[PDB]
Structure 1
């Protein structure tokens, strides 16, 4: 409970990775849990202790690609594993980083809440998950959180706000293969969910504390150098209020 937990939220290619990985260098007390995107593009489970000595860990399926190619078939599968992989990364880093730090802060790239309330919810609303899939999913997520929830509770949220058009541009800059067919319209739906959750705060979750969690909203539409100074100043001022 000593470690402050801050989630960085924003649409696909808003610049969360870029920002927080540059941000964390400012303090030895600051670390980041990246999102497990690579685990989704190359799906692998653990090898047997003898088998790994003679067999390579091969590249597996790309469930990320599967979800984008056929959302109505693969959404449930993808969202389940996205959330599983995140909880795993976040719980291990909480248990193992920043043991001694004076004022330790762990920044999470997204959270289990955006997994459910933004991404999966948007899939359900789009009829990419039917009623049964959506029910199973929330049942699972609810249960995981009653177990592995207290430890993962956020002290604050930093919302990196970029327009859908900026995000689409940045998807192209970044060049991640599975995202190259994403339409403006999809990013726009994701944009609206983040705005409802983080800016207007009209989106109600099953997690009551989140109605109160402090939120810092940052505009990241400009080129990185143009606003970075003010952004840093704002983050520092925000962290000192938690």
Structure 2
């Protein structure tokens, strides 16, 4: 009943900027931001900052981070499905990233960079499979919007936002994440364990230009994509 659309993109590509203009185009649209605040101030439902711990020593903290990040995403996405959107006329829920980018882009890249060992990567995949088996269907996607930007543009945008934890991220790391996005969503050559994803419709939007000038043409392309689903 609720249509579910994931907004995917590299660090600082403009997912939140792009989301912050959606709700005003239709009252039946809702957004689930990445729960970054559960990540920088770890609290039970002045805590530790597990995002910062991972960037300071990724070989120590990537497994713990990646596991918490994805559990907290599932909880937030489930809370939105089962809230007041449930009773609108033509409901659409836009997710800032998905459980699929958690595993196939970020967790995978850290394992390949030796920031998780074989044991951690096995436990992580086991946990991910199981959590999706319990909640997979309620969260299944109807479509994906890819906000495509160069790694160099992303590096400039990290500087523009000034989020403290991200200021040390090097271009080399953003470029690794870029090539995983391109494999998954442009070339569609990245293989996953979730067969339906190979056919899910994708809308690719180039967001390298200034948002102020590109806004109107982006909106039209989104409105048209959504008509097809």
Please classify the TM superposition score into its range, dividing by the shorter chain length: over 0.9
**Alpha-carbon separation, structure 2, partners of 1:225 and 1:97:** 32
Deviations 1:104-162 (A, max 9, x none): 10000000000000000000010000000000000000000011000000000000001
Structure 1 runs (4+) deviating above 3 angstroms are none
Shift of 1:197: 0.4
TM superposition shift of 1:102? 1.9
Equivalent residue number for residue 19 of structure 1: 18
Give the superposition deviation at 1:20.
1.1
Cα displacement (A) at 1:210: 0.2
Shift of 1:25: 1.3
Distance 2:86 2:61 in 1: 39
DSSP-derived class of the 2:20 partner = helix
Shift of 1:100: 2.6
Deviation at 1:190, TM superposition (A): 0.2
TM-score (norm 2): 0.98
**Aligned residue runs from structure 1 range 32-43, under 5 A:** 32-43=31-42
Counting matched residue pairs gives 228
Structure-1 separation of matches of 2:84 and 2:177: 32
Distance apart, 1:208 and its partner CA: 0.4
Distance of 1:112 and 1:231 partners within structure 2: 25
Q: Please list every run of 5 or more consecutive structure 2 residues that lacks an aligned counterpart in the other structure.
A: none
Change (3 A) 1:142 1:176: same
Question: Which of 207, 216, 221 is residue 234 of structure 1 equivalent to?
Answer: 221
Equivalent position of 2:148 in the other structure: 161
Larger Rg: 1
User: What CA RMSD, in Å, does the superposition of the two structures yield over aligned residues?
Assistant: 0.6
Q: Offset of 1:39 from its aligned partner? A: 1.0
Shift of 1:103: 1.2
User: Given the two structures, how large is their TM-score scaled by the length of structure 1?
Assistant: 0.93
